[PDB]
């Protein structure tokens, strides 16, 4: 089906005979494309070396929240770390965190009983989740939890427990009997990373190297974790200085600002299903003509990527 326009037509029709006519053809042509990557120029490393190694994490009635910002974020080191007994993620899958890139990231951290780790999931119901650490039902983030029975047990009744991300302080306040001989009654340390995916400028971005920028070819791009397959072309769109991206009538992305050089690129999809094949019957000839729908003839090799065909 990728051989020639008549083969693309025979495969569009699911037929070896083609009757006389003009046929608007489904794509089938081979689509090689090169990756392109872009992120802001920044050199700080994110403080996970503080957050995951602090001498004591907080009690889960009054958990502590750390803002991560303005840094390169090696989530691959966290995900490779032997320290973590479980590493859930929701709205993101952890392998993608090194390609992905965020405005801020919030780490919430505390100690709980090991059986309570199952309650740290989106919109959960239970005697910790419904009372002092509720996650949103639309939470986008990772939950990282491990037994700390070597660190935090003594038991160690200095560890205590009592809406989404709410904090509150007679009180229902209670203590944990953390002793080394306790399997579910162990202390577990936990960190919860919440990702701020808003369309404002990103500041917390994975250690993935920005490529050179390729215009006028079909590329598999990434700008600040916004990906796509498309041709990039520099454009005359008058972005106001606060605007980072541009959208079509469909609200699909039509343009982007490069984060390293503040030029505006239009995006165009590579496919070009705008091909029609003019044929006499295959009983008359295998000769065809091709109509490239509403393109200028000098632009045809660029419209169809004829060097890759």
């Amino acid at each position: 089906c990728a051989l020639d326009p008549l083969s693309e037509t025979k495969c569009t029709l699911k037929s070896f005979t083609v009757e006389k006519g003009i046929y608007q053809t489904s794509n089938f042509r081979v689509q090689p494309t090169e990756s392109i990557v872009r992120f802001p120029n920044i050199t700080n490393l994110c403080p996970f070396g503080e957050v995951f190694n602090a001498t004591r994490f907080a009690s889960v009635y009054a958990w502590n929240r750390k803002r991560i910002s303005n840094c390169v974020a090696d989530y691959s080191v966290l995900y490779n770390s032997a320290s973590f007994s479980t590493f859930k993620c929701y709205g993101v899958c952890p392998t993608k965190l090194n390609d992905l890139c965020f405005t801020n990231v919030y780490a919430d951290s505390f100690v709980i009983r090991g059986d309570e780790v199952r309650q740290i999931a989106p919109g959960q119901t239970g005697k910790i989740a419904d009372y002092n650490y509720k996650l949103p039902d639309d939470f986008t983030g990772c939950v990282i939890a491990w037994n700390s029975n070597n660190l935090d047990s003594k038991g160690n009744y200095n560890y205590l427990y009592r809406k989404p991300f709410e904090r509150d302080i007679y009180f229902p306040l209670q203590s944990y009997g953390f002793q080394p001989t306790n399997v579910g009654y162990q202390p577990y340390r936990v960190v919860v990373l919440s990702f701020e995916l808003l369309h404002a400028p990103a500041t917390v971005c994975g250690p993935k190297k920005s490529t050179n920028l390729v215009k006028n070819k079909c590329v598999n791009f990434n700008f600040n974790g916004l990906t796509g397959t498309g041709v990039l072309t520099e454009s005359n769109k008058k972005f106001l200085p606060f605007q980072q991206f541009g959208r079509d009538i469909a609200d699909t992305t039509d343009a982007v600002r490069d984060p390293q050089t503040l030029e505006i690129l239009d995006i165009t999809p590579c496919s070009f299903g705008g091909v029609s094949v003019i044929t006499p019957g295959t009983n008359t000839s295998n000769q065809v003509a091709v109509l490239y729908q509403d393109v200028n003839c000098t632009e045809v090799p660029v419209a169809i990527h004829a060097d890759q065909l």
Binding site: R67, S69, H199, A200, K237, L240, Q243, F245, G246
Partner: protein, 203 residues
């Protein structure tokens, strides 16, 4: 005193370019044809509620209005956002301030940042703990009132400060007039032109 704000107090809802399109958006907006409380800075700066958010404007020839305060108790029990322009640049803090009995500018801490004939318009909102500021400036030729016409306020700065704000006050240079209105959850239809600029709106 009061005055009726016309089509004023509209702002760019997101950091996205759109052009030659009509876009429906739901957000905290100042309603059209709505009463804003009017105060002279010459011949006061009382405390106001913040409600869901604030539209603030000043009509000027003098730069007497120079800053703002936001918080809950405003008495060092908790963080309070202080914003001042020092006549060279903007300076911002969220410290546990113990403010004066009648605050003015002379002619613990966490977050900090550093950067009638005219009308200066600003919007303050505090969604998800992000204190978002929007801005616009224009010439005018009226001492009494806001102009009957449209211009969209564009982002000044965004601060990830997390304060549970419920109260507000302005700051004046002492040894001009200003207007306060409250934002409300509203659907607006916005008219983005070829230059990606919001040129009109429907409440």
């Amino acid at each position: 005193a009061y005055t009726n704000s016309f089509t004023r107090g509209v702002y760019y809802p997101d950091k996205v370019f759109r052009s030659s399109v009509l876009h429906s958006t739901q957000d905290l907006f100042l309603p059209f044809f709505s009463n804003v409380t009017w105060f002279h800075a010459i011949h006061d700066n009382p405390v106001l509620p913040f409600n869901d958010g604030v539209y603030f404007a000043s009509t000027e020839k003098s730069n007497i209005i120079r800053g703002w305060i936001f918080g809950t108790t405003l008495d060092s029990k908790t963080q309070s956002l202080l914003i001042v322009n020092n006549a060279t640049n903007v300076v911002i803090k969220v410290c546990e301030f113990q403010f004066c009995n009648d605050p003015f500018l002379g002619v613990n801490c966490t977050f900090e940042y550093v950067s009638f004939k005219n009308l200066r318009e600003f919007v303050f909102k505090n969604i998800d703990g992000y204190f978002k500021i929007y801005s616009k400036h224009t010439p005018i030729n009226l001492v009494r009132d806001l102009p009957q016409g449209f211009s969209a306020l564009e982002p000044l700065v965004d601060l990830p400060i997390g304060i549970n704000i419920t109260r507000f006050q302005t700051l004046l240079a002492l040894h001009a007039a200003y207007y306060v209105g409250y934002l409300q959850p509203r659907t607006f239809l916005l008219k983005y032109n070829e230059n990606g600029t919001i040129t009109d709106a429907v409440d």
